[PDB]
Write a protein that binds this ligand. Structure first.
Ligand SMILES: O=Cc1c[nH]c2c1ccc1c3ccccc3[nH]c12
Lengths: 7, 273
């Protein structure tokens, strides 16, 4: 569930 | 001469911002990061004082790069035929705040307080220099693991600071404020405070509070970890739905939860070594 989020 | 002056090591990362590599400056072995951005992807450009036409990010970085601070400094840059190459500082040893929180979980308040304070100082610096970052997030914060110092990276979504409304945005949506979600409009400082709100929750809870637009505009903050009332209060204030109900940077730094911050050295010693 935790993740990076791109621009 | 770009290739004679720097020694290129491994790729550190890549994505929306382009491709960043590890490097050492041949003259004096200074560690650097070398960032490549394709000209076809820069939709925002500026002019140096030196006549020449550069990507806004170079403009922004030269504005905040004088003297010391919590901003990764631009040491040099180069134009190539289809790209620009940016020579940036590299701390050693380093980890980014995103990986740090994934590995360590929710941070103790003493540590969250030292980190958050340093981010606040760094963001105040940017604003003092006329620069709005527009992508404040754990992934854009590097931690110098020995000095205990936090550094802001990636001004590629940035803009000159202004007092009128912004109607464009290419930063990270889950850190964007609700007036952006519903109206495609925001003011700089108040949107910056909202994203710092998301960052503070991220630190003390181990992940961001919102993933979806409805959660962002809902402005309901549920705490999944034990967090002190004073800290929950700061977070909720930063994440107020009306922009004008958010705290100024001064008000954040005078909040009771922000008192007795650790020095960077102390933070490295207690929490990082
Ligand atoms: O500017 C965009 C960036 C995306 N990842 C970066 C960026 C800039 C500098 C660095 C950097 C500097 C030292 C170590 C890891 C890094 N990762 C990045």
């Amino acid at each position: 569930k935790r993740r990076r989020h791109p621009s | 001469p770009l290739e004679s002056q720097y020694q290129v090591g491994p790729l550190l990362g890549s994505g929306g911002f382009g491709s960043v590599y590890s490097g050492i400056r041949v003259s004096d072995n200074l560690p650097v990061a070398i960032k490549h951005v394709e000209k076809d992807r820069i939709s925002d450009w500026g002019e140096l004082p030196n006549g020449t036409r550069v990507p806004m990010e170079v403009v922004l970085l030269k504005k905040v790069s004088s003297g010391f601070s919590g901003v990764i400094r631009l040491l040099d840059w180069f134009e190539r035929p289809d790209s620009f190459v940016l020579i940036l500082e590299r701390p050693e040893p380093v980890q980014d705040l995103f990986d740090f929180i994934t590995e360590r979980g929710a941070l103790q308040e003493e540590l969250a307080r030292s980190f958050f304070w340093q981010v606040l100082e760094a963001v105040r610096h940017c604003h003092n220099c006329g620069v709005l970052h527009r992508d404040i997030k754990d992934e854009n914060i590097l931690i110098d693991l020995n000095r205990g110092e936090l550094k802001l990276i990636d001004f590629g979504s940035g803009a000159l600071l202004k007092d009128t409304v912004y109607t464009d945005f290419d930063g990270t949506r889950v850190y964007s404020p609700p007036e952006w979600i519903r109206y495609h409009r925001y003011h700089g400082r108040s949107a910056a405070v909202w994203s710092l709100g998301i960052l503070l929750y991220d630190m003390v809870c181990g992940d961001i509070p919102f993933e979806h637009d409805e959660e962002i505009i809902g402005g309901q903050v549920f705490f999944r970890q034990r967090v002190s009332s004073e800290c929950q209060h700061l977070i909720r204030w930063c994440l107020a739905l009306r922009p004008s109900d958010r705290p100024t940077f001064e008000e954040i730094q005078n909040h009771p939860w922000m008192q007795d911050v650790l020095l960077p050295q102390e933070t490295a010693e207690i929490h990082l070594h």
